[PDB]
Design a protein around this nucleic acid. Structure first.
Ligand SMILES: [Mg+2]
Ligand SMILES: [Mg+2]
Ligand SMILES: [Mg+2]
Ligand SMILES: [Mg+2]
Ligand SMILES: [Mg+2]
Ligand SMILES: [Mg+2]
Ligand SMILES: [Mg+2]
Ligand SMILES: [Mg+2]
Ligand SMILES: [Mg+2]
Ligand SMILES: [Mg+2]
Ligand SMILES: [Mg+2]
Ligand SMILES: [Mg+2]
Ligand SMILES: [Mg+2]
Ligand SMILES: [Mg+2]
Ligand SMILES: [Mg+2]
Ligand SMILES: [Mg+2]
Ligand SMILES: [Mg+2]
Ligand SMILES: [Mg+2]
Ligand SMILES: [Mg+2]
Ligand SMILES: [Mg+2]
Ligand SMILES: [Mg+2]
Ligand SMILES: [Mg+2]
Ligand SMILES: [Mg+2]
Ligand SMILES: [Mg+2]
Ligand SMILES: [Mg+2]
Ligand SMILES: [Mg+2]
Ligand SMILES: [Mg+2]
Ligand SMILES: [Mg+2]
Ligand SMILES: [Mg+2]
Ligand SMILES: [Mg+2]
Ligand SMILES: [Mg+2]
Ligand SMILES: [Mg+2]
Ligand SMILES: [Mg+2]
Ligand SMILES: [Mg+2]
Ligand SMILES: [Mg+2]
Ligand SMILES: [Mg+2]
Ligand SMILES: [Mg+2]
Ligand SMILES: [Mg+2]
Ligand SMILES: [Mg+2]
Ligand SMILES: [Mg+2]
Ligand SMILES: [Mg+2]
Ligand SMILES: [Zn+2]
Lengths: 99, 144, 159, 56, 118, 142
RNA sequence: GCGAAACAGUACCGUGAGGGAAAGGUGAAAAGAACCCAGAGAUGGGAGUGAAAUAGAUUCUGAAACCAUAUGCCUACAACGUGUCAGAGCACAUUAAUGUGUGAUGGCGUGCGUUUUGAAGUAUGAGCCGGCGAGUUAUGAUAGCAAGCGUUAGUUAACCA
RNA sequence: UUCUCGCAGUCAGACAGUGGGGGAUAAGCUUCAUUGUCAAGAGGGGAAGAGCCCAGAUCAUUAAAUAAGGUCCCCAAAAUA
RNA sequence: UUGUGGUAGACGAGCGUUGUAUUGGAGUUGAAGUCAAAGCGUGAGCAUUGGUGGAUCCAAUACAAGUGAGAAUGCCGGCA
């Protein structure tokens, strides 16, 4: 019913048919990925990580986050540097919980 | 990216409580009163929604101050004029106005805020066993 | 410049005790009257020097790449005077040769008059002597008609 | 004395908030019907039932 | 060749003005005050990204600490028991469990309480 | 259906005219005339003339009922100024700014006239978005 | 750009020598708005001419500061470099995008240039907006890079066509 | 960090620890030697602080372990004897 | 694999404006200008649509500069 997965470095609590956003995974939209690291599943929680517990997910999109403008400025010191960041993400939805 | 946590959307599970300060220390009573008023002890704490329960304090004149603080520690209030600094000893506060003393002690343990006004409002402090607050059906808990 | 512009060489206001800022003239660069600090001048050179052998080498490679290519046909005196001085005949010649849109350049050694009478109302095509063509005129051509004796003079000039 | 800081366009309107005008009380003449400001002679010189001035 | 400035100054100025949209009065109208506010707002945004990472951790710690005190256990010992039992779960997900799934959160506390470490 | 009347370079200042214009906005025709005829202000015998002309060209030119007209908006926009030199003391001088106002009065017959203005604004926005979508379809077509 | 695109060395300043501005654009064609209504009139609203009158003599385009009107959101126990990160509720629907407008409330937060060991500064400079406003040219020297020509090399200056 | 060539900027420094001179074992004083920081360096502690302590900011993450410092409330985190 | 705080300063790589030369292209079925919008870039910056506007403008490769405005009790005009 619920699981604690570790995609990238973050931990997500996921239900059935739940769409959450993780860091870029380098996978085309439409494929069927299998998340490996699972912490808690149902009621049996493994200490380091559960063995053979897999979370089957489908990748929906590979969009980018909102633009972030980093403007570093040293007051009265002739230093105004500007930079932009658009962090890529990937959205994926849970399909089935492997036993 | 990640999943955001749940925060209460102006949900009011607030309830009424009763405590008896028969022999409770001023500071030891005030710390738990502030925790109860702020709702910090609640499982779900959203710090912009004042999710904290009301509290009524009985027997304010019966509280105690340890040591020689009843005659050596002074409470100070200054008006905006010159010389308007009024001083009251611990014993005088414990006799003349004990409700104000407990009220001020609880207020001092709260963050400078625009919600702290409402938080200190939800403290009903009485100097006697009687109280006009029995229509709220407040539950009774000790040493809180 | 600041000195050349007609204006008052006096101080408009006093140096001190006036609420206004210090000023020294009414025709300063930061004034609306206008004294241009540096500005363009009519004494600039704009000229560059290139060695004689370097120019010969540039002309050598440009002739090499332009020659032995398409639209580099050979021409003689007969059609240089068969034009009759009428540009209609030369328009037909360019139409027959399919060189209408090309910027064909005639390279001529004897300065024929009938060919020069024509091709003068044509902003596209042009005719030059061997001692008059340069690198730029050669590679702007996109097509050229070279006389046989012009070609004989070309090997001689290169040496 | 003069302002060391310029007053914005918001403080100006806050001060002018009390500069609004009031509508003077008006009534109807009892012989011709046109509106006249209260407690004053109308345009016909007829105040109540008394002919005050000659007609305009 | 007198190059004249036009559409160059105005475009780069209107960019700063567009960024400073929603400010108080002249802070969105004049280019100079708008530019200063955008730079200051960028500094604030930079500093608060770091501070968000720390403040949300503190909130999770507070919620988790409260959820434990109802059961008689403290935060300082709960994390120690988690480490000895090898269980690796964020305080974020643990707090999310205690707010959304009380029964399963109670299951985790029960195992860390008494079961043999490893 | 808004009828309107205008007056350029009115000698009254906009500051001293807005005070009188706010006494007639939203008022009925007859009541607005009655209010403006008995107010002891300079900018009262000029707004009255503009109002009367606007009523005339509303019930004659545009064909309105005449018993449903209300003052929709009466404003005094800023007009061109005139600069003069007032001689001060000790040889100094200041600049007197003679202020003028562009007066405009507008009356309507429909008490819901603001809705149509918002509707026209919405229509302009919709046409912009519709053009963008049509351009996107063309882009995908190629 | 000549100070001067217009009737500019004019208006204007000074006893005088002298100093010295600003200001261009209707429309293809005046066809420059007959006539009606309100008004004392200018003028405005219709009509008419015109492709266009929101091109109307205020006459190409019309920016910002500035002044007013209004849909939507918020604001009268509130300590504020006015923003930022979270965040309810309200109102909409887009360069379809984990959307947009406002922001009850919580955490954090003393501007920009200058010159100084050190400026939130009780040091300094700017009321705001727009335009203009400060590393050039000529002749030589050195060094880096690159090309042409080369071991009795290399290259012309003036001048002539 | 040695040698050769091109282009510089710098010649007003400040404080803390340590050894001294002048001063009175006064100075946030003045003049030296040496170790560091600031100048030209944010973050955390010191309630607030250029120079003290922990350290060195490429950007994003509502992930985890720690340094100085701390765990009644403000304000994250403790219990035994 | 080692790195990426930074003033004075040294070095390298680029953006943008006006014009000229070669190529191609758009424009009264609407160019420049100009306003608005919920776009794209690491940065100077670059697009799309709609309104207004009424005749020029754009892309590539080179070349030449009166080539980049927030400050000078800066000049001029307008407005608080
Ligand atoms: Mg000039
Ligand atoms: Mg206002
Ligand atoms: Mg007043
Ligand atoms: Mg400029
Ligand atoms: Mg006099
Ligand atoms: Mg005279
Ligand atoms: Mg008209
Ligand atoms: Mg005008
Ligand atoms: Mg115009
Ligand atoms: Mg209120
Ligand atoms: Mg109060
Ligand atoms: Mg305070
Ligand atoms: Mg606050
Ligand atoms: Mg805030
Ligand atoms: Mg503050
Ligand atoms: Mg600067
Ligand atoms: Mg100084
Ligand atoms: Mg000093
Ligand atoms: Mg101050
Ligand atoms: Mg001073
Ligand atoms: Mg100075
Ligand atoms: Mg000043
Ligand atoms: Mg300026
Ligand atoms: Mg050289
Ligand atoms: Mg020294
Ligand atoms: Mg010294
Ligand atoms: Mg020392
Ligand atoms: Mg000593
Ligand atoms: Mg000493
Ligand atoms: Mg000293
Ligand atoms: Mg310095
Ligand atoms: Mg520091
Ligand atoms: Mg600190
Ligand atoms: Mg680093
Ligand atoms: Mg730890
Ligand atoms: Mg420790
Ligand atoms: Mg705590
Ligand atoms: Mg660097
Ligand atoms: Mg160009
Ligand atoms: Mg356009
Ligand atoms: Mg310049
Ligand atoms: Zn009467």
């Amino acid at each position: 019913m619920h699981a604690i997965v570790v995609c990238g470095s973050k931990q997500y609590l996921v239900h059935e048919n739940d769409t959450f956003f993780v860091e870029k995974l380098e996978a085309p939209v439409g494929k069927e990925i299998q998340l490996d690291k699972v912490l808690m599943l149902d009621e049996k929680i493994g200490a380091p990580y559960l063995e053979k517990a897999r979370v089957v997910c489908v990748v929906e999109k590979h969009g980018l986050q909102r633009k972030v403008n980093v403007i570093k400025h040293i007051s009265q010191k002739h230093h105004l540097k500007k930079y932009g960041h658009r962090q890529p993400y990937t959205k994926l939805k849970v399909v089935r919980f492997v036993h | 990216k990640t999943s955001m946590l749940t925060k209460e959307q102006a949900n009011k599970r607030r309830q009424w409580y009763i405590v008896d300060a028969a022999g409770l220390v001023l500071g030891k009573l005030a710390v738990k009163a502030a925790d109860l008023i702020r709702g910090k002890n609640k499982v779900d704490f959203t710090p912009n929604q004042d999710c904290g329960d009301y509290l009524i304090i009985i027997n304010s004149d019966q509280v105690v101050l340890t040591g020689n603080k009843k005659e050596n520690e002074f409470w100070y209030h200054h008006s905006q004029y010159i010389g308007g600094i009024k001083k009251v000893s611990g014993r005088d506060m414990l006799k003349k106005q004990s409700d104000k003393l407990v009220y001020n002690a609880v207020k001092g343990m709260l963050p400078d805020n625009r919600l702290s006004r409402r938080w200190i409002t939800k403290v009903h402090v009485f100097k006697g066993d009687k109280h006009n607050m029995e229509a709220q059906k407040p539950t009774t808990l000790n040493w809180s | 410049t600041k000195g050349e512009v007609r204006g008052g060489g006096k101080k408009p206001y006093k140096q001190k005790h006036t609420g206004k800022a210090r000023q020294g003239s009414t025709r300063n660069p930061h004034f609306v009257g206008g004294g241009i600090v540096f500005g363009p001048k009519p004494n600039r050179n704009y000229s560059l020097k290139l060695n004689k052998k370097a120019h010969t080498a540039a002309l050598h490679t440009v002739w090499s790449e332009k020659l032995a290519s398409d639209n580099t046909h050979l021409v003689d005196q007969n059609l240089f005077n068969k034009t009759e001085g009428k540009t209609k005949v030369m328009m037909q010649f360019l139409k027959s040769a399919k060189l209408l849109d090309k910027n064909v350049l005639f390279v001529v050694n004897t300065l024929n008059t009938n060919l020069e009478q024509s091709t003068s109302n044509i902003k596209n095509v042009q005719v030059k002597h061997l001692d008059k063509v340069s690198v730029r005129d050669l590679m702007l051509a996109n097509a050229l008609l070279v006389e046989k004796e012009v070609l004989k003079a070309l090997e001689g000039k290169f040496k | 004395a003069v302002q060391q800081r310029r007053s914005s366009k918001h403080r100006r309107d806050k001060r002018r908030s009390h500069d609004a005008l009031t509508a003077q009380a008006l009534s109807v003449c009892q012989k011709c019907g046109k509106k006249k400001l209260f407690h004053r002679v109308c345009s016909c010189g007829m105040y109540g039932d008394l002919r005050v001035k000659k007609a305009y | 060749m007198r190059i004249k400035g036009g559409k160059q100054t105005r475009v780069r100025r209107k960019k700063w003005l567009k960024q400073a949209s929603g400010s108080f009065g002249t802070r969105h109208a004049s280019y100079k005050v708008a530019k200063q506010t955008v730079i200051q707002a960028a500094k604030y945004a930079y500093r608060d990204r770091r501070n968000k990472k720390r403040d949300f951790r503190s909130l999770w710690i507070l919620r988790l600490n409260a959820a434990l005190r109802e059961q008689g256990m403290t935060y300082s010992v709960f994390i120690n028991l988690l480490k000895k039992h090898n269980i690796e779960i964020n305080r974020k997900v643990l707090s999310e469990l205690a707010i959304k799934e009380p029964s399963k959160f109670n299951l985790i506390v029960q195992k860390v309480k008494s079961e043999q470490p490893k | 259906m808004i009828a309107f009347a205008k007056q350029f370079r009115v000698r009254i200042s906009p500051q001293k005219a807005r005070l009188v214009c706010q006494l007639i906005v939203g008022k009925k025709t007859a009541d607005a005339q009655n209010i403006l005829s008995n107010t002891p202000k300079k900018a009262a015998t000029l707004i009255a003339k503009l109002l009367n002309s606007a009523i005339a060209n509303a019930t004659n030119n545009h064909g309105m009922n005449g018993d449903a007209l209300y003052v929709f908006e009466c404003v005094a926009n800023q007009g061109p100024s005139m600069k003069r030199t007032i001689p001060r003391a000790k040889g100094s001088s200041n600049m007197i700014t003679k202020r003028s106002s562009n007066l405009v009065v507008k009356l309507s017959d429909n008490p819901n006239e603001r809705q149509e203005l918002i509707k026209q604004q919405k229509a302009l926005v919709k046409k912009r978005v519709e053009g963008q979508q049509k351009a996107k379809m063309a882009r995908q077509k190629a």
